[PDB]
Write a protein that binds this ligand. Structure first.
Ligand SMILES: OC[C@H]1O[C@H](O[C@H]2O[C@H](CO)[C@@H](O)[C@H](O)[C@H]2O)[C@H](O)[C@@H](O)[C@@H]1O
Length: 560
């Protein structure tokens, strides 16, 4: 690759060696999660040089008993450097919490979901700050909310929907803390990392930071937060609008549309999945093909949706991942959101000429959505696949739109200039109604059952929320009806799942009421940050009447 690469740490490189040994030692019916080995930290007082030398003696297939003894002796385990934290603003039953939820069974369930913020609340241990080089966990200034289970660290875009839920939970200090943490990542690296781990320094994630700041500010009117956030949001904005992230698509009327793609600064196996990734690339002839494929994999991770037919050139063929060729609808929704957020914030802070720069920017991206992304026949917005490398501008071609149907195709409904357009909303409602994405438990993320997790039969919390929120803001009766119907489907199914398992799941199998989803490279995970956040946010928006059942026995097609 001629393209840019952010180096990793010697620790991460070493821990991949441990990972490879482990995935070879265990029987195929007991293979562990590879991520757990890159989350280890070095047990004092031994240096990395000492532990690597001892690992070399050990490996010079290691039996499972010998390997576990080695790992127990030289490492503190995964997550041991991430400490439980009692959130200062947590209250077991906040006054006025979900007062519009009059179904007492539902409100008590939501209180239990609210209670899970304590489980997800952590603080990076002091050991990390005093000797950061011994941990892959990154130091952070404030306590975090994590997604849960194997996601032993704060993630970027999950934090938005977590924050939406924290605001229902009346936890505005914890919410600001998340923003403070991500702001410190932008300060250090120039972008917000995929997550607060050493092996994520090479990529970002969908740019939700401005939206987090906006949603908090809209409640607390925290002017200091906005003032602190503006220069960091400007850094983030230039990051997405320069270098390999920026592409130019020229339309038939002569307008150059400046848009973004994902682009991880990495061209190797992801350390956290190093064994899986080396295997999946084993079939490529040249090193250059492998490096291109690895960049496309790590870019699909940067998309927040690893993995999906959405990023494959010949779906469902995983080896055809091609994420750096995709100008994605949802990424550019978030960048439109950033331009609107930053214009609002500079108006608030009293920078009128700055606010005009981003009004001009948002109108220009609004033009790009009408020309580059919209597809009138489909009634939705389509990812745009590049013909070339993205170095130089290219001319828009209708055949380069991905006509496959995804929940992300409806992401622009989240933007107020779109959901304010009655005629457009009507077309989108019809397209969503007729797409096949609306399933018993919510909105399918795609229509292809690939075995990947960001595909049918799964639906995902962030994707439900953006469509429900956007549709619910239009003045169109059919849209507000559709949003509430989807929100109650999603709530109900998550409750039915919880009634069985006592846990909230990462993703739902939305083709069936009350089933969680799976697929992909790791087992279904529970917690779960954005899933808790959307459950609570939907309940605050819609409530739940006392006489409306949440149980599976009743299946009304009429609402109350
Ligand atoms: O398996 C390694 C990958 O894990 C992550 O993908 C997850 O991270 C999400 C969103 O930010 C989770 O909350 C979500 O449910 C997963 O899809 C990570 O983001 C990737 O970088 C890792 O390669």
């Amino acid at each position: 690759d001629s393209g840019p690469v952010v180096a990793t740490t010697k620790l991460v490189t070493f821990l991949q060696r441990v990972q490879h040994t482990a995935l070879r030692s265990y029987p195929k019916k007991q293979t562990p999660d590879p991520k757990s080995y890159i989350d280890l930290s070095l047990k004092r007082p031994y240096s990395l040089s000492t532990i690597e030398s001892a690992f070399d003696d050990l490996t010079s297939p290691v039996p499972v008993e010998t390997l576990e003894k080695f790992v127990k002796e030289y490492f503190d385990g995964a997550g041991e450097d991430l400490l439980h934290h009692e959130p200062v603003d947590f209250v077991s039953d906040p006054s006025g919490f979900l007062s519009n939820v009059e179904n007492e069974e539902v409100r008590e369930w939501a209180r239990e979901v609210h209670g899970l913020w304590r489980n997800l609340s952590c603080r990076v241990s002091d050991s990390v700050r005093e000797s950061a080089d011994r941990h892959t966990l990154l130091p952070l200034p404030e306590p975090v909310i994590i997604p849960g289970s194997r996601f032993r660290e704060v993630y970027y875009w999950d934090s938005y929907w977590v924050i939406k839920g924290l605001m229902t939970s009346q936890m505005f200090t914890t919410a600001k803390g998340l923003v403070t943490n991500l702001m410190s990542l932008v300060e250090t690296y120039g972008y917000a990392l995929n997550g607060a781990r050493a092996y994520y320094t090479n990529r970002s994630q969908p740019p939700l930071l401005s939206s987090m700041v906006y949603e908090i500010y809209n409640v607390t009117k925290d002017e200091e937060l906005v003032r602190k956030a503006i220069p960091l949001l400007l850094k983030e904005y230039e990051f997405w609008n320069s270098g390999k992230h920026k592409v130019v698509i020229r339309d038939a009327n002569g307008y150059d549309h400046v848009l973004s793609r994902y682009y991880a600064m990495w061209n190797k196996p992801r350390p956290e999945s190093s064994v899986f990734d080396e295997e999946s690339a084993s079939g490529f002839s040249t090193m250059l093909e492998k490096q291109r494929f690895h960049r496309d994999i790590a870019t699909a991770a940067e998309s927040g949706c690893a993995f999906s037919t959405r990023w494959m050139r010949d779906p469902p063929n995983f080896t055809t991942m091609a994420t750096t060729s995709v100008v994605p609808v949802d990424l550019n929704v978030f960048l439109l959101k950033m331009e609107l957020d930053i214009a609002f914030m500079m108006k608030v802070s009293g920078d009128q000429n700055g606010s005009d720069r981003f009004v001009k920017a948002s109108k220009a991206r609004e033009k790009a959505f009408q020309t580059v992304f919209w597809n009138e026949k489909a009634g939705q917005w389509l990812d745009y696949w590049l013909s070339s490398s993205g170095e130089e501008s290219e001319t828009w071609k209708a055949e380069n739109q991905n006509t496959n149907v995804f929940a992300s195709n409806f992401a622009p409904i989240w933007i107020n200039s779109i959901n304010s357009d009655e005629n457009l909303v009507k077309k989108v409602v019809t397209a969503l109604k007729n797409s096949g994405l609306i399933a018993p438990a919510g909105i399918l993320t795609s229509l292809t059952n690939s075995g990947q997790q960001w595909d049918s039969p799964n639906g995902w919390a962030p994707q439900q929320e953006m469509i429900v929120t956007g549709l619910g803001r239009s003045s169109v009766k059919e849209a507000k009806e559709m949003a509430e119907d989807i929100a109650r489907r999603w709530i109900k199914s998550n409750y039915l799942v919880y009634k069985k398992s006592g846990t909230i799941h990462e993703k739902l199998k939305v083709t069936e009421l009350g089933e969680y989803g799976g697929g992909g490279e790791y087992m279904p995970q529970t917690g779960f940050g954005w899933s808790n956040g959307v459950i609570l946010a939907f309940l605050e928006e819609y409530g739940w009447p006392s006489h409306l059942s949440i149980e599976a026995l009743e299946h009304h097609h009429h609402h109350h």
